[PDB]
Design an enzyme around this catalytic site. Structure first.
Site, mmCIF file in Angstrom:
data_model
loop_
_atom_site.group_PDB
_atom_site.id
_atom_site.type_symbol
_atom_site.label_atom_id
_atom_site.label_comp_id
_atom_site.label_asym_id
_atom_site.label_seq_id
_atom_site.Cartn_x
_atom_site.Cartn_y
_atom_site.Cartn_z
ATOM 1 N N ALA A 10 0.780 -1.249 0.000
ATOM 2 C CA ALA A 10 0.000 0.000 0.000
ATOM 3 C C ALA A 10 0.812 1.302 0.000
ATOM 4 O O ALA A 10 1.335 1.721 1.035
ATOM 5 C CB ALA A 10 -0.956 -0.002 1.190
ATOM 6 N N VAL A 52 -4.494 -4.101 -1.660
ATOM 7 C CA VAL A 52 -5.190 -3.483 -0.536
ATOM 8 C C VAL A 52 -6.565 -2.867 -0.824
ATOM 9 O O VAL A 52 -7.409 -2.803 0.070
ATOM 10 C CB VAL A 52 -4.288 -2.404 0.127
ATOM 11 C CG1 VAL A 52 -4.179 -1.188 -0.778
ATOM 12 C CG2 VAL A 52 -4.837 -2.022 1.490
ATOM 13 N N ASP A 53 -6.800 -2.414 -2.055
ATOM 14 C CA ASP A 53 -8.087 -1.805 -2.381
ATOM 15 C C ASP A 53 -9.168 -2.859 -2.619
ATOM 16 O O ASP A 53 -9.798 -2.926 -3.676
ATOM 17 C CB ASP A 53 -7.939 -0.852 -3.584
ATOM 18 C CG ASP A 53 -7.364 -1.529 -4.821
ATOM 19 O OD1 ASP A 53 -6.565 -2.481 -4.685
ATOM 20 O OD2 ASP A 53 -7.704 -1.085 -5.939
ATOM 21 N N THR A 60 -6.169 -12.307 -22.154
ATOM 22 C CA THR A 60 -5.273 -11.196 -22.442
ATOM 23 C C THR A 60 -3.819 -11.466 -22.059
ATOM 24 O O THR A 60 -3.182 -10.652 -21.398
ATOM 25 C CB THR A 60 -5.755 -9.880 -21.767
ATOM 26 O OG1 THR A 60 -5.914 -10.071 -20.354
ATOM 27 C CG2 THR A 60 -7.083 -9.444 -22.361
ATOM 28 N N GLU A 84 1.062 -9.479 -14.013
ATOM 29 C CA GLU A 84 0.040 -10.489 -14.288
ATOM 30 C C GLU A 84 0.364 -11.329 -15.520
ATOM 31 O O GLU A 84 0.100 -12.535 -15.549
ATOM 32 C CB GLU A 84 -1.324 -9.813 -14.452
ATOM 33 C CG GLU A 84 -2.457 -10.748 -14.847
ATOM 34 C CD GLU A 84 -3.820 -10.115 -14.626
ATOM 35 O OE1 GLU A 84 -4.265 -10.068 -13.460
ATOM 36 O OE2 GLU A 84 -4.438 -9.650 -15.612
#
Ligand SMILES: [Hg+2]
Ligand SMILES: [Hg+2]
Ligand SMILES: [Hg+2]
Ligand SMILES: [Hg+2]
EC number: 2.4.1.40
Length: 263
Positions: A60, A130-131, A163, A221
């Protein structure tokens, strides 16, 4: 490695699927975790007898420190409740971390922005953003040497639509005819050893790409997906574990929404 105690629970029918609407096992025999596939009482017993400690890491910075309060408070209500938990909050604002009340056997370490530490303090590591907020049970059913989580936006898509990084010049490259699932870069974990192995591979791969002047379409990712394609996860979590109700609603195939994005 002690014996389980006597337990009373309904018998499972061998000639009856537990879920007839979804795939509950991968081709390499790793379970895909959906509500209904596990008896949490049996699993809780197994992991508690091993006095399992789970590390939860969140990164964060700047404006994101504002999401810590809700993240930690909801984790206290739904994450590995009953087991030993060690939160690791990496932040650039140590004094900004909220003072959240933790249950017994749970602790939080604030690290201002070491690897050896993880190996000595926890048995498993879970890495998320964290969000988010926990809305339902997220327990030991996810623990395994290495796990990936099905991205909520692609679980029903054909691999051609995934993707993945599609440029051969990138270390994260995956051709159109390859790929098992599209995993989330923001929710993965496993044993400390396997998690560090994955992060180390990702770090090295991204550096090679940088030297070659290329950046994967979805950064970390894209690389995580390349890693899990070549090193099959021992467990795969269903989209129940990372969902966005605002963008995807609440499909019948989802019996529970456990971890979600904050509006
Ligand atoms: Hg991590
Ligand atoms: Hg990688
Ligand atoms: Hg990386
Ligand atoms: Hg990665």
């Amino acid at each position: 490695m002690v014996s389980l105690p006597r337990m009373v629970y309904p018998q499972s029918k061998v000639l009856t699927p537990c879920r007839k609407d979804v795939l509950v096992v991968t081709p390499w025999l790793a379970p895909i975790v959906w509500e209904g596939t596990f008896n949490i009482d049996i699993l809780n017993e197994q992991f508690r007898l091993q006095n399992t400690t789970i590390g939860l890491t969140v990164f964060a910075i700047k404006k994101y420190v504002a999401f810590l309060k809700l993240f930690l408070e909801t984790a206290e209500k739904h994450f590995m409740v009953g087991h030993r938990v060690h939160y690791y909050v990496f932040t650039d604002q140590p004094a900004a971390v909220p003072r959240v009340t933790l249950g017994t056997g749970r602790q939080l370490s604030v690290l201002e922005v070491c690897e050896r530490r993880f190996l000595s303090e926890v048995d498993y590591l879970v890495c998320v953003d964290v969000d988010m907020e926990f809305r339902d049970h997220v327990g030991v059913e996810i623990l395994t040497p290495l796990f990936g989580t099905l991205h909520p936006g692609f679980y029903g898509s054909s691999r051609e639509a995934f993707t993945y990084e599609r440029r051969p010049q990138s270390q994260a490259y995956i051709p159109k005819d390859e790929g098992d699932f599209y995993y989330l870069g923001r929710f993965f974990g496993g044993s400390v050893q396997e998690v560090q192995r994955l992060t180390r591979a990702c770090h090295q791969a991204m550096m090679v790409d940088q030297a070659n002047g290329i950046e994967a379409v979805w950064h970390d990712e894209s690389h995580l997906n390349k890693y899990l394609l070549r090193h099959k996860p021992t467990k795969v979590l269903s989209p129940e574990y990372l969902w966005d109700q605002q963008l995807l609603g609440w499909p019948a195939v989802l019996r529970k929404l456990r971890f979600t994005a904050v509006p």
